Every structure is written in C-alpha cells, then in structure tokens.
Design a protein around this ligand. Sequence first.
Ligand SMILES: O=C(NCCc1cccs1)c1ccncc1
Ligand SMILES: O=C(NCCc1cccs1)c1ccncc1
Ligand SMILES: [Mn+2]
Ligand SMILES: [Mn+2]
Lengths: 137, 137
Amino acid sequence: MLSGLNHLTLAVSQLAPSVAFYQQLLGMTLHARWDSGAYLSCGDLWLCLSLDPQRRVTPPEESDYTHYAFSISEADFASFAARLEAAGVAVWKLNRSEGASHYFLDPDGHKLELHVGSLAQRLAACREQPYKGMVFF
Amino acid sequence: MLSGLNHLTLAVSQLAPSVAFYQQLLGMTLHARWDSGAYLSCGDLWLCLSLDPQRRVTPPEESDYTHYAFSISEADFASFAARLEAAGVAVWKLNRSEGASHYFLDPDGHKLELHVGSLAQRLAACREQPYKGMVFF
Ligand SMILES: O=C(NCCc1cccs1)c1ccncc1
Ligand SMILES: O=C(NCCc1cccs1)c1ccncc1
Ligand SMILES: [Mn+2]
Ligand SMILES: [Mn+2]
C-alpha cells in the first residue's frame, strides 16, 4: 500500500543555478550536495535535484501541463509572488480556478505553482459547481 | 514561506486508462473524475490527472530523469513491485542507486518509483556510502 509522495526528483541542466533557485530564491533547506545532485526539503517534501545532460531548457509552450504546486498561506502568497517577479521569474499561466495560484517556471522550464488550498477545499467548491461530466466517489 | 507539495499534476493522454492505473493498479483513492481530469489521493498527496492533448506517450530513453517516488513500507515493497511486474508494467531503471527502489512507468511514460525510507534515512545511508563528492550541511 502506498502511503504518500516519497520524493520529487527534478532533472536539471546546471546544478548551481538550480540550487540557487530552490534554496535561495524559494527558501528550501539544502541538506546535501554531490557532484551530480542535491537534496533539499520543503516542509514534508523531499526534493532531489539531479544533474542530467539530457535535461533541455524547455519553453512552456513545448511541455505539457505536468506541474508541481507548493503550499503557501494566503497571508504569504502576494509577497512571495512579488519576490519571484522581482527576480524576473517567468509566469506560464494566469489563475482562473479556486484558491490563489501563481504559475512560474524554474531555470530549466519545470512548471511550478504556488497554491493556497487543500484537496478538501477544491472538492467542496466542485460539489457546489461541478465541472463538466463530474462524478464524485 | 513554502511548506511542502500542495499537489502533483500529471498530464495524461487518455484519462480512463490513467485513472485505472493510479486507482486500480496502484491503489490510490479516487475522489472525483470529470471529462478532463481526476483527483486522487495517496496518503497526504493530492494527485491530479489532467487530460492534455499535448501529452505524448514517451519512452524512457526520450525523457530526462525527472521522476515521482511513492512511499511504501519495507514489509510491502517486494510484493507490490512483483505485482507490477506480473501486470506487465514497463520499467525504466534497474540499478538501486538511492536505496530500496523499484522504477516503473505509467501509461504515458511518466517515471515513477516505489521507495522505502525517508530523507533522514537516505542521508544516514549516504554518510556510509556517499555519492561522489557528497557534502552534508
Ligand atoms: O494500468 C494497468 N496496467 C499497466 C499498464 C502499463 C503498461 C506500461 C506502463 S503502465 C491496468 C490497470 C487496470 N486494470 C488493468 C491493467
Ligand atoms: O493486487 C492488487 N492490486 C492490483 C490488481 C490489478 C491488476 C491489474 C490491474 S489492477 C491489490 C491487492 C490487495 N490490495 C490492494 C491491491
Ligand atoms: Mn495546479
Ligand atoms: Mn528516486
């Protein structure tokens, strides 16, 4: 039986800018680094950066919608988004769904998001206003 | 301040086979499905499957090392891996370079993993068998 997400591994083309982004800009804790990767944590999340020459710096129009959302409080959302903006971090989508969301790109074009709100909150909103074809279990 | 992973969203090319993979084969909990997506949970993880016409079925030699690992206990690991194998689930890696792991593919070629152990346990193991050049902070 699976009990949760164990870790998220992102392939990166250059380790130093990726460590700078996740540790310094995004404030994650750096636990270890080696010649070809790093381990960070963000709350319960175990993040691994893996140096991979096969990683392409990928424009958002050229990747699918797969993405990784980080939790932040409503109170902290706007100043964190403003930090990303000051740092020149690109946005790949505008929010049009419930709960605050900021959609931003990492140095290799990994699609990231800041989101406020849980699955329970989303399901409650969907019960009131179901998406097309929506069924609950 | 970021506090963990709010959700993982995977782009899928065919919604029904992907729901079946995560719910029926992997045992995740299905909460809702609609014409263009589904919401599941795996312990605390919120997983969203999003139907995306841009998603391609991608062989593992064509994608980078980005991957998603799910936690499983030491008692359950081997029999879960063996059932994925008996079900014909494709694989993408064999060498256990980060502990007790089984590497397998979803229907679209998303790179998945079963892993036993926490970040703390991996750091302790790495102190004895470090990756090349490893430093601990
Ligand atoms: O997902 C299933 N089987 C693995 C498919 C895959 C082949 C290669 C990667 S995943 C499945 C789900 C429900 N009922 C029967 C079978
Ligand atoms: O063996 C299991 N599930 C995969 C079955 C499938 C085979 C092919 C598609 S789904 C299982 C056993 C006990 N409790 C929960 C799950
Ligand atoms: Mn999202
Ligand atoms: Mn892994």
